Write a protein that binds this ligand. Structure first.
Ligand SMILES: [Ca+2]
Ligand SMILES: [Ca+2]
Ligand SMILES: [Fe+3]
Ligand SMILES: [Fe+3]
Ligand SMILES: [Fe+3]
Ligand SMILES: [Fe+3]
Ligand SMILES: [Fe+3]
Ligand SMILES: [Fe+3]
Ligand SMILES: [Fe+3]
Ligand SMILES: [Fe+3]
Ligand SMILES: [Fe+3]
Lengths: 172, 173, 172, 172
C-alpha cells in the first residue's frame, strides 16, 4: 500500500485501469480511421488530419489517467490493446457515425466510473472526472453530432461531392 | 442572520472554522520546519526555502477559507494555534515524512468536511472543496512521497551527502 | 487493383503491416516504462520523461510506415497490440537494459525486412528503410548502451545515489 | 575516357542518356497539358498552373541527370524530343489520368536503371537514383492517385462543376 494512498478504493483503482485501456483503444480506432482516409482511393486529407488529431488527443486522456493512478497511489496494469472493429470504414459519414458511437460508449464508461466513485465517497476522483472528462465528452459528442448531420443533409453517403466539400470547408 | 446566507448550515460554518484553524496550524508547522534547516548545525538553505514556501501556501489556504466563510454568511471564529509537536525535526528525510503525515491529516479533515457538505446538500461548498482544496492535497501528497522515496533511495538520513545533494538538485533546480 | 501500386510485392506489404505493429508495440512498452518511473515509490521524473519521449517517437515511426503503406498502394491491417512484457521494470538500469534489448529486436526485424526487399528488388523500400530507420536504430541502440554503461559504472542498480544523479545530470 | 571516370560502365552512361530524354519528354507533355487548360473553351487556370509547375519540375530532373553524367565523366547525347501523345486531353480527370500513367511509366524506367546499376556494382549511381528520383516518383504517383480519385467521386468527367471546384479548392 503506497505511502500516498488515502481514500482510494480498489474498485476505483481497477476501473481507472479499465478506462486507460479504453482510452488507448479509441486512440487506435482513430488512428485506423485516419490512415483509411490517407488511402489513395479514398484521398480525403482533412478527414485524415481530423482523425489523426482525435487520436493523439485520446492518447493524452490515457496518460492523464495514468498520472492520476500514480497520484492516488494505485498501480497501472495495461492489457492488450484491441484491434479496431473495422479495417475499412466506407465513407466519411460512416467514419463519423462510428466515431460518434465510440464516444457515446466511452462516455457511458466514464459515467459508470463516476457513479462508482460517488459510491466510494471519493470526491477528488469525482471532480477529476467531471473537470477533465465529462465536458470533453459532451462536447466531443456534440461535435460529431453536427458533422454527421451536415454530411447527410449534403447528400452523403451517396454523393462523393459532399464528402470532398466537407473535407475542405468544415475540416480544412 | 446575514442577508447573504442561503443554504449554509451552521455545522458547515463550524467545520470551515475548524478547517481554517487546521491550515493555520500547518503553516505554523512548516515555519518551524523551515527555520530548523536554517540552523548553522543543519544548514540546508533549500530545505529551509522549500518549507517557508509551504508555510506561505497554507497561510493562503486559510485566508481563502476565511474569504469563503464571509462570502457564505458564516462568521469566522479563531482559536489558539498550538505549537507543533517538535522543535527539532531531526533530518531532512524526517521533516519530509512528518510533512507527508500532516498533509494527510489535513486531507482527511477536508474529506470529512466534504462528506458533511454532501449530507447537508451544500454543493457550492462541495465544489469549492473539490476545486481549491482536494486536487491541491493530492498533488502535495504525491510530491512529498516522491521526495521521501528519493531521500530514502539515496541513503538518508545516515548519508549526509544524500541530504546535501537532494537539497542542491531537487529543491534548488 | 489500387492505381498507384507498382513494384510493390504482396510479401513486403505484409511485413510492413508486421513492422507497423511492432513499432506500436514498442510505444506501449516505453509508455509503461514511463509511468513506472512516475510512481511515488520510484520517483525519477527524468527517466519518466525520457521514456515518454521514446514512446511518442515510436508512434511517429509507426505512422510513417502507415503512410508508406498507402504511398505504395498496399493496405493496412492493424492487429492487437500485445501488452508489454512487464508491469514493474524494477529499476532505471533494468529499464534501460530491456530498452536496449527491445530496440535490437526491432532492428533485427527491420534488418530482416531489408533482406525481403532486396530479394524482391524494391530499391525504394530498401532506401526508405535505410534512410528513415536503420540509422535511427543504430543511434538509439548506441545511446541506450551508453546509458546502461554509465549506470553500471555508477553502481546501479545497488546504489540509489547513482540512479538519482543520472536522472539529474544525464537525463535532465 | 575522362580523367574523372571511375566505376562507370557504358550501359549506365547510355541509360542515363535515355532517362534525360525521358524527363525532357514528360516536361513537354506537361507543358502541352498546361496550355490545354489555358484554352478559352476549357478555362481551368489552376489545372494549368499545376501542369506548368510539374513541367518546370521535370526539366529540373533532366538537368540534374545531365549534371551527374558530367560528374561521372560520361557524355551527354540528346535526341529528338518527341511530340506528346495527344494535343487535346478532354478533361481534368483525363489529363490527371494520363499524367499518372506517364509517371508510372517514368518510374518503371527509373527502376530498370536502378536494377541495371546494381548489376554493374555501381553504388554511387544506385544511391543517386534512390535519393533523388525514387521517392519523388512514389510521391508524385500518390499525388496523382488522390486527385483522380477525388475528381471521380465528385462526378467527373460528367459534371463540369466538379472540375471547376477542384480547380479552386484542391489546386487553387
Ligand atoms: Ca469542479
Ligand atoms: Ca541506398
Ligand atoms: Fe476526442
Ligand atoms: Fe477520450
Ligand atoms: Fe492546505
Ligand atoms: Fe501544501
Ligand atoms: Fe527511440
Ligand atoms: Fe530521437
Ligand atoms: Fe522504432
Ligand atoms: Fe512531377
Ligand atoms: Fe521526373
Amino acid at each position: 500500500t503506497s505511502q500516498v494512498r488515502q481514500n482510494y478504493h480498489q474498485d476505483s483503482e481497477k476501473a481507472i485501469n479499465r478506462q486507460i485501456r479504453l482510452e488507448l483503444y479509441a486512440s487506435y480506432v482513430y488512428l485506423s480511421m485516419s490512415y483509411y482516409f490517407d488511402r489513395d482511393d479514398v484521398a480525403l486529407k482533412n478527414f485524415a488530419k481530423y482523425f489523426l488529431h482525435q487520436s493523439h488527443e485520446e492518447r493524452e486522456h490515457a496518460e492523464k489517467l495514468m498520472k492520476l493512478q500514480n497520484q492516488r497511489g494505485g498501480r497501472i496494469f495495461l492489457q492488450d490493446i484491441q484491434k479496431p472493429d473495422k479495417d475499412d470504414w466506407e465513407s466519411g459519414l460512416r467514419a463519423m457515425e462510428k466515431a460518434l458511437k465510440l464516444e457515446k460508449k466511452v462516455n457511458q464508461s466514464l459515467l459508470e466510473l463516476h457513479k462508482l466513485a460517488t459510491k466510494k465517497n471519493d470526491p477528488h476522483l469525482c471532480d477529476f472526472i467531471e473537470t477533465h472528462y465529462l465536458n470533453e465528452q459532451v462536447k466531443a459528442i456534440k461535435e460529431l453530432g453536427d458533422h454527421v448531420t451536415n454530411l447527410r443533409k449534403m447528400g452523403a453517403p451517396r454523393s462523393g461531392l459532399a464528402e470532398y466539400l466537407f473535407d475542405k470547408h468544415t475540416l480544412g
